[PDB]
Scaffold this active site. Structure first.
Site, short mmCIF file in Angstrom:
data_model
loop_
_atom_site.label_atom_id
_atom_site.label_comp_id
_atom_site.label_asym_id
_atom_site.label_seq_id
_atom_site.Cartn_x
_atom_site.Cartn_y
_atom_site.Cartn_z
N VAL A 26 85.44 66.92 70.48
CA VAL A 26 84.97 65.84 72.06
C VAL A 26 84.27 65.17 70.25
O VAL A 26 84.01 63.82 70.68
CB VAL A 26 83.96 66.61 72.29
CG1 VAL A 26 82.57 65.29 72.77
CG2 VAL A 26 84.00 67.09 73.70
N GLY A 27 84.57 64.98 69.15
CA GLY A 27 83.80 64.09 68.32
C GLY A 27 82.39 64.33 67.31
O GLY A 27 81.47 65.40 67.76
N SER A 28 81.76 62.90 67.36
CA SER A 28 80.48 62.78 66.57
C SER A 28 80.13 63.62 65.44
O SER A 28 81.11 64.76 64.74
CB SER A 28 79.36 62.46 67.07
OG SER A 28 79.54 60.74 66.73
N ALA A 30 76.73 64.41 62.99
CA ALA A 30 74.77 64.14 61.31
C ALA A 30 74.75 65.21 61.27
O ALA A 30 74.45 65.36 60.62
CB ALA A 30 74.92 62.76 62.37
N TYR A 31 74.35 65.70 63.07
CA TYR A 31 73.74 66.81 63.42
C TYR A 31 74.25 67.21 63.63
O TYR A 31 74.48 69.28 64.18
CB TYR A 31 72.43 66.48 65.09
CG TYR A 31 71.70 65.24 63.48
CD1 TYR A 31 71.00 65.48 62.96
CD2 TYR A 31 71.03 64.55 64.65
CE1 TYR A 31 69.68 64.23 62.63
CE2 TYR A 31 70.04 63.08 64.10
CZ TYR A 31 69.45 63.77 63.22
OH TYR A 31 68.56 62.48 62.74
N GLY A 32 75.86 67.43 63.41
CA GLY A 32 76.78 68.29 63.83
C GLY A 32 77.93 68.05 65.25
O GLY A 32 77.77 66.99 65.42
N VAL A 34 80.62 68.62 68.54
CA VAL A 34 81.46 69.24 69.85
C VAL A 34 82.54 69.86 70.17
O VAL A 34 83.02 68.47 69.88
CB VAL A 34 80.12 68.62 70.83
CG1 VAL A 34 79.06 68.41 70.30
CG2 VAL A 34 81.26 67.93 72.13
N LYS A 49 78.44 73.40 70.41
CA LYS A 49 78.21 72.11 69.54
C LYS A 49 77.61 73.16 68.43
O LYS A 49 76.53 73.81 68.48
CB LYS A 49 76.80 71.20 69.98
CG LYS A 49 76.43 70.58 69.01
CD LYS A 49 74.91 70.80 69.09
CE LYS A 49 73.88 69.37 68.71
NZ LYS A 49 73.31 69.89 70.14
N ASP A 164 69.84 65.20 74.65
CA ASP A 164 70.54 64.10 73.96
C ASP A 164 71.92 64.66 72.90
O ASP A 164 71.54 65.84 72.77
CB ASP A 164 68.70 65.22 73.12
CG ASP A 164 67.82 63.91 72.62
OD1 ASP A 164 68.83 62.56 72.91
OD2 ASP A 164 66.76 64.15 72.34
C1 LIG Z 1 76.75 71.24 73.43
C2 LIG Z 1 75.14 71.27 73.74
C3 LIG Z 1 74.56 72.19 72.29
C4 LIG Z 1 73.46 71.62 72.77
C5 LIG Z 1 73.26 69.68 73.35
N1 LIG Z 1 71.52 69.90 72.84
C6 LIG Z 1 71.09 69.29 74.21
O1 LIG Z 1 72.01 68.52 74.98
C7 LIG Z 1 69.81 68.87 73.87
C8 LIG Z 1 68.30 68.47 72.36
C9 LIG Z 1 68.06 68.46 72.48
C10 LIG Z 1 66.63 67.91 73.46
C11 LIG Z 1 67.39 68.26 74.67
N2 LIG Z 1 66.45 67.32 76.23
C12 LIG Z 1 67.22 67.52 77.02
C13 LIG Z 1 66.37 66.90 78.25
O2 LIG Z 1 64.75 66.33 78.23
C14 LIG Z 1 64.56 66.95 76.92
C15 LIG Z 1 65.40 66.70 75.25
C16 LIG Z 1 68.74 68.05 75.09
C17 LIG Z 1 73.89 69.11 73.78
C18 LIG Z 1 75.45 70.34 74.20
N3 LIG Z 1 75.34 69.09 74.94
C19 LIG Z 1 76.43 67.84 74.32
N4 LIG Z 1 75.94 67.39 73.68
C20 LIG Z 1 76.50 66.63 72.72
N5 LIG Z 1 77.55 65.76 73.73
N6 LIG Z 1 78.15 66.52 74.83
C21 LIG Z 1 78.99 65.49 75.74
C22 LIG Z 1 78.87 66.31 76.65
C23 LIG Z 1 79.97 66.46 77.94
O3 LIG Z 1 80.15 66.56 79.04
N7 LIG Z 1 80.64 65.32 77.91
C24 LIG Z 1 81.16 64.64 78.73
C25 LIG Z 1 81.61 63.61 79.25
C26 LIG Z 1 82.71 64.62 78.61
C27 LIG Z 1 83.43 65.71 79.75
C28 LIG Z 1 84.60 65.66 78.53
C29 LIG Z 1 85.61 65.60 77.45
C30 LIG Z 1 84.40 65.14 76.18
C31 LIG Z 1 83.17 64.99 77.09
C32 LIG Z 1 78.16 67.61 76.82
C33 LIG Z 1 77.67 68.81 77.56
C34 LIG Z 1 77.17 67.44 75.50
#
Ligand SMILES: Cc1ccc(NC(=O)c2cccc(N3CCOCC3)c2)cc1Nc1ncnn2cc(C(=O)N[C@@H](C)c3ccccc3)c(C)c12
Length: 338
Positions: A26-28, A30-32, A34, A49, A164
Site C-alpha cells: 500500500v506504500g509509505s 518512516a514509521y513502517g 502497510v 502494518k 493515524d
Molecule cells: C494497518 C494499521 C495498523 C496500525 C494503525 N495505527 C493506527 O491507525 C493509529 C495509531 C495511533 C493512533 C491512532 N489513533 C486513532 C484515533 O485516535 C487516537 C489516535 C491510530 C493503522 C493501520 N491502518 C492503516 N495504516 C496506515 N494506512 N492505512 C491505509 C488504510 C486504508 O484502508 N486505506 C484505504 C483507502 C485503502 C483502500 C484500498 C487500498 C489502499 C488503501 C488503512 C486501514 C491504513
C-alpha cells in the site's frame, strides 16, 4: 505457532501468518509500511502494518508500545479497531518485529475531496462521525493532534474511521494555532480546530489554510478569524509570543457567511464555533454533536464515551528493553475482538 511465511516484497522481509494472503504494498514508511491483504480466517480485506525497527531507539520503543496500548483499548465504530497483532518471534529474546492488522478501508477523505467537493448531506454524515469518534477518544484523555484528510477513512459502505499515520498534504494546515509554535498550553479542542479545517475543505473543495510554514500558517489563520482579542492576550503567558502577536497589523474577523457563500447556514455557524482562536471558547466534540447541523443524525443515547485509559507510562523513563518487554506482554495478552 501459526503458519507463518516470508515474502521479500517492498524491499523489506515480511513474515506473516498464512491466514494473511494476497500481500499488496500500500506504500509509505518512516514509521513502517502497510500492505493490503486478505484474511483467510474471517474472509475480509485487511491492511497489515509492519513497523520500521520498532525497538531501534528509546523513542522507537516508546512509540511502538504507545500505539499498541492505544489500539488495544480502542473500541468505537468511528475509530480504527485493532484486528490482530503478531510477531514471528516465539520468545521475547527474539522479539524484534511487530505487525498490526486492521480492516482495509474504502478510501481516505484526502482523495474523496480530490475527486471533488461532496454534498452537504454527505458532509454532515462525515463530520458527525468524526465528532462521534472524538467524543469517545477525548473522553479517555486522548488527543489525536494529527487530524488531516488522510487520517480519515471510509468503511466498506460509508462508516467513517479515525486512524493515524495513514498512508504532499501538510498536517500543519490543520494544526490549531496554540500548538503551532509552542504557543502555549493546549487541550483536546486542538482536534476540533482541525475538524473545522477538514469540514471547510469538504464544503469548498480547497484547503482552508495552506500555509507554507509556521509563520505563514498563523498569518493565513489570523486573516480569517482575525488577530487576538485583548481578552485572549490576557491569557497568553509568553512575553515573546505576546510581542510578536501584538506587533502584527491588527486583522479583523471575517464573516464566515461571506467566506462560505452558498453553504448551509447551519454548516457555517458550526464552523464559526470550531474555528475559534481561544481554545477556551472552542466548541467541544460533545457539544458540537448536539449542534443543529447534525439533528438528522444526532442521537445522544448512541454517542458513547470511552472507559478510562491510563497513560502514566508517558511519564516513565525506561530502557529499550523495558519498553520492548512491555510491548511483548501487550502482544501476547492480545484477545482478538470479534
Ligand atoms: C494497518 C494499521 C495498523 C496500525 C494503525 N495505527 C493506527 O491507525 C493509529 C495509531 C495511533 C493512533 C491512532 N489513533 C486513532 C484515533 O485516535 C487516537 C489516535 C491510530 C493503522 C493501520 N491502518 C492503516 N495504516 C496506515 N494506512 N492505512 C491505509 C488504510 C486504508 O484502508 N486505506 C484505504 C483507502 C485503502 C483502500 C484500498 C487500498 C489502499 C488503501 C488503512 C486501514 C491504513
Amino acid at each position: 505457532r501459526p503458519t507463518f511465511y516470508r515474502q521479500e516484497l517492498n524491499k523489506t522481509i515480511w513474515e506473516v501468518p498464512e491466514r494473511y494472503q494476497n500481500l499488496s504494498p500500500v506504500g509509505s514508511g518512516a514509521y513502517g509500511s502497510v500492505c493490503a491483504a486478505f484474511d483467510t480466517k474471517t474472509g475480509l480485506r485487511v491492511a497489515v502494518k509492519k513497523l520500521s525497527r520498532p525497538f531501534q531507539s528509546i523513542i522507537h520503543a516508546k512509540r511502538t508500545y504507545r500505539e499498541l496500548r492505544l489500539l488495544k483499548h480502542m473500541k468505537h465504530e468511528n475509530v480504527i479497531g485493532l484486528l490482530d497483532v503478531f510477531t514471528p518471534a516465539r520468545s521475547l529474546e527474539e522479539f524484534n518485529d511487530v505487525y498490526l492488522v486492521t480492516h482495509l478501508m474504502g478510501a481516505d477523505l484526502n482523495n474523496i475531496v480530490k475527486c471533488q467537493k461532496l454534498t452537504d448531506d454527505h458532509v454532515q454524515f462525515l463530520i458527525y462521525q468524526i465528532l462521534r469518534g472524538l467524543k469517545y477518544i477525548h473522553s479517555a484523555d486522548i488527543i489525536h493532534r494529527d487530524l488531516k484528510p488522510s487520517n480519515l477513512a471510509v468503511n466498506e459502505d460509508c462508516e467513517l474511521k479515525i486512524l493515524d499515520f495513514g498512508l504532499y498534504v501538510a498536517t500543519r494546515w490543520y494544526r490549531a494555532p496554540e500548538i503551532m509554535l509552542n504557543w502555549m498550553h493546549y487541550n483536546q479542542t486542538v482536534d476540533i480546530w482541525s475538524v473545522g479545517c477538514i469540514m471547510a475543505e469538504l464544503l469548498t473543495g480547497r484547503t482552508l489554510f495552506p500555509g507554507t510554514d509556521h509563520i505563514d500558517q498563523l498569518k493565513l489563520i489570523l486573516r480569517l478569524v482575525g488577530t487576538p482579542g485583548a481578552e485572549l492576550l490576557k491569557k497568553i503567558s509568553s512575553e515573546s509570543a505576546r510581542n510578536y502577536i501584538q506587533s502584527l497589523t491588527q486583522m479583523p474577523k471575517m464573516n464566515f457567511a461571506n467566506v462560505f457563500i452558498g453553504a448551509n447556514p447551519l454548516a457555517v455557524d458550526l464552523l464559526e464555533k470550531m474555528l475559534v482562536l481561544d481554545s477556551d471558547k472552542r466548541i467541544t466534540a460533545a457539544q458540537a454533536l448536539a449542534h443543529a447541523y447534525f439533528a438528522q443524525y444526532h442521537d445522544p443515547d448512541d454517542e458513547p464515551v470511552a472507559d478510562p485509559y491510563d497513560q502514566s507510562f508517558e511519564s516513565r523513563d525506561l530502557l529499550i528493553d523495558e519498553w520492548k518487554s512491555l510491548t511483548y506482554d501487550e502482544v501476547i495478552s492480545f484477545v482478538p475482538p470479534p
